[PDB]
């Protein structure tokens, strides 16, 4: 497994970025607080998931990159690079967190329902969003892929925030959606996302810095990666309710904020009169027991194997596209995510 | 006044701003409904204000670029990036509205308090952000100084967030914070919520746009413009409370919030220990007998009249750096902002 190798060094790397990030204080002693501030935010939100993001760019970056190329320098920017991707996540997760009316991540209270922190997590999560670019400035800026690694990150952030729009947007609060549920809006809603930042990104960030620009190589490997997207996506609403929450470090909150979920669709798809109205009843409301009989609904139409199922085609119809697409790129870029992943 | 000039042409290019901004919707039918979400954020968030910071790059650029350099292009460019200025403005408004718990804003009520709204306005607000980057893309992308504006516009953000750090760490709810709000902490404070994105962006932006990108020059500018930025976000302390409402467009929360406030380290340099009692019980609660104790004090100790002394002391004192600094730009870049703002 080429990330377990990769791992404990790129985790490592992090207290340097901390370090890094928290010397603007030398030359201002003015904002010594706020730097403070940003260096708990950093500690609280940027460990303890699986750095799965990050360590596709220097996966990625490892195999791109002719190894004589692979100096000291350019393995820095890699890892540097890939924690821009981790703090991004990290500026998305705390202020999802707060939309989404979350308890915990990654195994502990959400960073706003601490006590003392509250609402000012809104300001917390923009530093983390801020911290991108200036680590990009700090140590790519005289690369020739400078402006390409920029402009990546910021279009990546408008198109996940156009898809967290239309996740928002298909879940109002106190408002039955049923009729909004449908394949065609979820598969939209997932591409926008999840699939562009957590896929697209990290690989299109590791071909630039390989010298790999043309356009119909970050397209070919776009179609491999947005695929990949949509199922960590479908995988993470099917984890939302049915997975372990001392794995997932998380509790679910899809039913009660009446997300436009995978399996709410599934449901959808396959639900008699009755169960429509149960559903119709029971969904998008805080009360655990309505709660459960969505659950009870979904374990009764047998939506954990046809999870299991779409898991098995999915994999495969990626599998397919990784033959179509990947040349002239190592295939192994591809599936050594593919593992991670599913 | 050159701004009252320039203004119905920049408020009218709005519509083409939004225009440009929801074309995304031609080759992407699926994200419509966002796209849609979006304008009605800018429609609500980027309109009512008086428009001085965009108003400032549009007049610097008309005054520091020759006239013959002023084709049809270049014009709508500079109005662009004003636009951008006041989509950073929106982005910043719309969230820290949330931090502050205000109630209007420019004379309506706050876009996170209409019913239906609430904490997805986080989204809102940062969908507001992108639009800057997405405008610079689209109209400078092949200018000398793209890379220098989006910096620009970037580093501003990141210093006005540290900013925002400070006043949040400075005024936690629930403790009494009398002890830090200093001069000298107030000063920093406003230095990096206020100054830079206020005052020193726009007319950067408009220099870069000039071709004036030498670091002296920017610098010089600088010195100006951040003691500029320092009374204006006085004068917003003072207004909070002491402004009409019916002008202001916004209800005060200063006090409630336990705010380092100008008006409150005048208060504290000026306070007898029994007056000092007072607002140690009363600063930074809900309850509006509270508050009005806090006013009282302030008026007992007649600040507005320290505020007008400070606006005319304040006024020389920029005049003066004015004198020292404007060289070799045009005094007038300096000074029909200066009108604007006192
Ligand atoms: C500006 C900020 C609000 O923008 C975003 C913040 C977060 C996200 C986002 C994207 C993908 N996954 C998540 N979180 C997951 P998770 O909460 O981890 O299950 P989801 O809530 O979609 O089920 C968040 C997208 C955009
Ligand atoms: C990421 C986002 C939270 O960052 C910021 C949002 C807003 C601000 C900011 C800066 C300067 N003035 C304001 N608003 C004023 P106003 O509410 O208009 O009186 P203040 O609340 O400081 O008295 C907001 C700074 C940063
Ligand atoms: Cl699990
Ligand atoms: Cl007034
Ligand atoms: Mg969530
Ligand atoms: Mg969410
Ligand atoms: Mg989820
Ligand atoms: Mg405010
Ligand atoms: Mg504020
Ligand atoms: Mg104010």
Same mark, same amino acid.
């Given at each position: 497994?080429?990330?377990?190798?990769?791992?404990?060094? =790129? %985790?490592? !790397?992090? +207290?340097?970025?901390?370090?890094?990030?928290?010397?603007?204080?030398?030359? !201002?002693?003015?904002?010594?607080?706020?730097?403070?501030? *940003?260096?708990?935010?950093?500690?609280?939100?940027?460990? #303890? #998931?699986?750095?799965?993001?990050?360590?596709?760019?220097? %996966?990625?970056?490892?195999?791109?990159?002719?190894?004589?190329?692979?100096?000291?320098?350019?393995?820095?920017?890699?890892?540097?690079? &890939?924690?821009?991707?981790?703090?991004?996540?990290?500026? =998305?997760?705390?202020?999802?967190?707060?939309?989404?009316?979350?308890?915990?991540?990654? &195994? @502990?209270?959400?960073?706003?329902?601490?006590? &003392?922190?509250?609402?000012?997590?809104?300001?917390?999560?923009?530093?983390?969003? /801020?911290?991108?670019?200036?680590?990009?400035?700090?140590?790519?800026?005289?690369?020739?892929?400078?402006?390409?690694?920029?402009?990546?990150?910021? $279009? +990546?952030?408008?198109?996940?925030?156009?898809?967290?729009?239309?996740?928002?947007?298909?879940?109002?609060?106190?408002?039955?959606? *049923?009729?909004?549920?449908?394949?065609?809006?979820?598969?939209?809603?997932?591409?926008?996302?999840?699939?562009?930042?957590?896929?697209?990104?990290?690989?299109?960030?590791?071909?630039?810095? /390989?010298?790999?620009?043309?356009?119909?190589?970050?397209?070919?490997?776009?179609?491999?990666? *947005?695929?990949?997207?949509?199922?960590?996506?479908?995988?993470?609403?099917?984890?939302?309710? =049915? &997975?372990?929450? +001392?794995?997932?470090?998380?509790?679910?909150?899809?039913? @009660?904020?009446?997300?436009? +979920?995978?399996?709410?669709?599934?449901?959808? $798809?396959?639900?008699?009169?009755?169960?429509?109205?149960?559903?119709?009843?029971?969904?998008?409301?805080?009360?655990?027991?309505?709660?459960?009989?969505?659950?009870?609904?979904?374990?009764?139409?047998?939506?954990?194997?046809?999870?299991? $199922?779409?898991?098995?085609?999915?994999?495969? !119809?990626?599998?397919?596209?990784?033959?179509?697409?990947?040349?002239?790129?190592?295939?192994?870029?591809?599936?050594?995510?593919?593992?991670?992943?599913?």
């Amino acid at each position: 497994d080429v990330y377990a190798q990769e791992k404990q060094d =790129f %985790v490592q !790397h992090f +207290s340097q970025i901390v370090r890094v990030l928290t010397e603007d204080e030398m030359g !201002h002693p003015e904002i010594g607080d706020a730097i403070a501030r *940003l260096k708990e935010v950093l500690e609280y939100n940027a460990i #303890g #998931g699986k750095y799965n993001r990050g360590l596709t760019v220097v %996966v990625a970056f490892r195999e791109l990159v002719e190894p004589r190329k692979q100096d000291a320098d350019s393995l820095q920017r890699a890892w540097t690079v &890939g924690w821009c991707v981790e703090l991004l996540q990290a500026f =998305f997760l705390v202020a999802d967190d707060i939309m989404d009316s979350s308890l915990t991540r990654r &195994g @502990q209270i959400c960073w706003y329902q601490k006590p &003392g922190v509250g609402l000012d997590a809104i300001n917390d999560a923009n530093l983390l969003e /801020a911290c991108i670019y200036r680590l990009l400035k700090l140590y790519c800026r005289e690369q020739p892929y400078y402006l390409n690694l920029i402009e990546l990150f910021l $279009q +990546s952030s408008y198109q996940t925030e156009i898809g967290q729009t239309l996740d928002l947007l298909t879940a109002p609060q106190g408002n039955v959606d *049923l009729v909004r549920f449908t394949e065609k809006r979820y598969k939209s809603i997932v591409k926008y996302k999840t699939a562009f930042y957590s896929f697209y990104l990290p690989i299109a960030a590791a071909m630039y810095m /390989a010298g790999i620009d043309g356009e119909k190589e970050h397209a070919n490997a776009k179609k491999i990666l *947005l695929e990949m997207g949509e199922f960590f996506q479908i995988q993470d609403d099917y984890l939302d309710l =049915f &997975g372990d929450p +001392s794995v997932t470090g998380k509790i679910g909150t899809d039913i @009660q904020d009446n997300k436009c +979920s995978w399996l709410v669709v599934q449901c959808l $798809q396959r639900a008699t009169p009755e169960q429509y109205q149960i559903l119709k009843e029971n969904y998008g409301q805080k009360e655990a027991e309505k709660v459960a009989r969505v659950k009870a609904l979904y374990e009764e139409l047998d939506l954990p194997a046809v999870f299991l $199922q779409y898991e098995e085609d999915s994999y495969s !119809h990626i599998m397919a596209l990784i033959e179509q697409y990947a040349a002239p790129l190592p295939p192994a870029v591809f599936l050594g995510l593919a593992r991670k992943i599913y």
